Design a protein around this ligand. Sequence first.
Ligand SMILES: Nc1nc2c(ncn2[C@@H]2O[C@H](COP(=O)(O)OP(=O)(O)O)[C@@H](O)[C@H]2O)c(=O)[nH]1
Length: 356
Amino acid sequence: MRNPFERMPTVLTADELIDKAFRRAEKAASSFKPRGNKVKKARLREELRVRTVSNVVRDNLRKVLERTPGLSTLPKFYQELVDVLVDRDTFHKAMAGIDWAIRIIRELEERYVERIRYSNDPNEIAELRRQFYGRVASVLRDIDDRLRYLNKAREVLKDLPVVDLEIPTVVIAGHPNVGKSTLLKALTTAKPEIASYPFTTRGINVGQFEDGYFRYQIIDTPGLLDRPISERNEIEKQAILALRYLGNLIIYIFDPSEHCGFPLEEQIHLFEEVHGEFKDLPFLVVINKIDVADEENIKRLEKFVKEKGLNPIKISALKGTGIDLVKEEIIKTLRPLAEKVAREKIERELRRYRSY
Ligand SMILES: Nc1nc2c(ncn2[C@@H]2O[C@H](COP(=O)(O)OP(=O)(O)O)[C@@H](O)[C@H]2O)c(=O)[nH]1
């Protein structure tokens, strides 16, 4: 796993590119040894300048288009968060402005080299190089705002959540203090890590537990699935709903004791709002805090739960009571997807091990 944009280079501003290009053209012209006639020598120098400016600009710009992943090549989850962080449509257009600039400059180069190559009026030969420089600087200034934006989008994109996008992932939801992280830590092997996540205070915990030779990713959702989604901006809402493309199973934890600081009825409302936003992912309801919970509420919960067609698992994340029942259930739910993912990995590769 990694950040898809780590390879995206710093984008030079229109001025920096202009200066780099003119400077390089200046250097190449003085150390060039023209051929014969006085006018022929100036003409071959001016041609060299036009080509050097054209190449230096096109090479730097083209590097941006080549080293930045095409958004369509990214997993849906990242496409969603990329859009949240810098706006997908704006990104595509900025990039297209770069491609446009590369294209017009190539055309201008071919156009001006011909005019110069075909001239015999020193006055004109000079004026033509001067015009080309003028036009190159102008084309680059036309996209300067786009370049500046691409450089800022570059810095912002460094905060993409660093998580595994291939292996099955379990997403833990529920109100604050219901035991989400306690459960994630009881579930994972190595210590949890922290992934950055748009619209969260301190990010989210990311863990992993291995069964056989298969890996299962576990994440919790503080600041994301611990409060009414409706009471949210359409953007942070998009950031939250992006989890649809990462999660393969959602574990929803209820705290019947209400020690979390939320009445059972409020936890049920949240469960229903979350259960509805993720209709295409399987759910595993866990009733936590059984070690301190009152039988009274637990009856209402199981009742309510079973009425939604779900068979809950009673547990105590703190004391380990039932954790193995959860791990077991995770494995039973996700092992097939894990095998399918594994196969498809051997597939994709076999298809390029025979490159040609
Ligand atoms: N009595 C009891 N307390 C628990 C249990 N699980 C977690 N807690 C405590 O409840 C509080 C919140 O748990 P936490 O994992 O931080 O909740 P999150 O905000 O949903 O991640 C903590 O102080 C945990 O120690 C449990 O099974 N029984």
